[PDB]
From a paper:
DsbA from E. coli K−12 (EcDsbA) was the first and is probably the best-characterised DSB enzyme to date. EcDsbA consists of a canonical TRX domain, a hallmark of proteins involved in redox homeostasis, with an inserted helical domain. The TRX domain harbours the conserved active site CXXC (C30-P31-H32-C33 in EcDsbA) that is featured in many proteins of the TRX superfamily. The acidity of this groove originates from a cluster of negatively charged residues (E24, E37, E38, D44, E85, D86 and E94) that map along a buried channel in the interface between the TRX and helical domains of EcDsbA.
The crystal structures of the three mutants containing the K58A mutation showed that the shorter alanine side chain at position 58 significantly expanded the size of the entrance to the buried channel. The binding of glycerol displaced w2 in all three structures and hindered precise analysis of the water network in these mutants. However, examination of the three lysine mutant structures showed that w1 was strictly conserved, forming hydrogen bonds to the backbone amide of C33. When E37 was present in the protein structures, water w3 was observed to form a hydrogen bond with E37 in both K58A and E24A/K58A structures. Additional water molecules (labelled as w’ in Figure 4F–H) were modelled into the electron density in the buried channel in all the lysine mutants. E24A caused a 2.9-fold reduction in the initial rate, while K58A resulted in a 1.9-fold reduction in the initial rate. The K58A mutant exhibited an oxidation rate of 2.10 ± 0.17 × 106 M−1 s −1, which is also not statistically different from the wildtype. However, the double-mutant E24A/K58A yielded a rate constant of 1.47 ± 0.06 × 106 M−1 s −1, 35% slower than that of wildtype EcDsbA. These results indicated that E24A and K58A did influence DsbA oxidase activity, but its individual effect may be too small to be detected in this assay.
Residue numbers in the entry: 1 to 188
The structure:
């Protein structure tokens, strides 16, 4: 078959009840996640092909970067709570990996301030229990798919994308295949 379990995707031995329809894990410290988002634009290419009524969810992970990695998962919770993911994704990736100007929680906050989030608004979100719950949700979701590394993407809590089984010859053929596989899985 054109799509095969073990080729473009694998199947979770323990499917996750109630999981987001399309769930991406990443770290702003992960070099391959930087390529996925800033060079390949995997998330946007996937979103453009999702069936009607299917949304993409993206969660940050703690296991890269120590203290700052956890601060970034909390800041990503703030971005989710405030609905500013599209304002801060590029400056967080570039701040951590390109300019390496993000070295502390204050430097993360500066990205939000510079993007026009008011200081009081960021700080109230950072300290909120809504954000504490969002951190816990990101952690629980990684546990539920037995996450071992990033980038990673899971469809309907049942299928894990397998980019190492796709055609990696041309970067744009690869992005197309990745996005087409997510669409296929979302309809399975």
């Amino acid at each position: 078959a054109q799509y095969e379990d073990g080729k473009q995707y694998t199947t979770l031995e323990k499917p996750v009840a109630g999981a987001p329809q399309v769930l991406e894990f990443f770290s702003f410290f992960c070099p391959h996640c930087y390529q996925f988002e800033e060079v390949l634009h995997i998330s946007d290419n996937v979103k453009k092909k999702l069936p009607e009524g299917v949304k993409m969810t993206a969660y940050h992970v703690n296991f890269m970067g120590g203290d700052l990695g956890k601060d970034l998962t909390q800041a990503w919770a703030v971005a989710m709570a405030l609905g500013v993911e599209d304002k801060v994704t590029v400056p967080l990736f570039e701040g951590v990996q390109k300019t390496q100007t993000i070295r502390s929680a204050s430097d993360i906050r500066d990205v939000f301030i510079n993007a026009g989030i008011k200081g009081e608004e960021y700080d109230a979100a950072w300290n909120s229990f809504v954000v504490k719950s969002l951190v816990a949700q990101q952690e629980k979701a990684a546990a539920d798919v037995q996450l071992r590394g990033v980038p990673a993407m899971f469809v309907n809590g049942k299928y894990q994308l397998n980019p190492q089984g796709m055609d990696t010859s041309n970067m744009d053929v690869f992005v197309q295949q990745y996005a087409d596989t997510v669409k296929y899985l979302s309809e399975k």
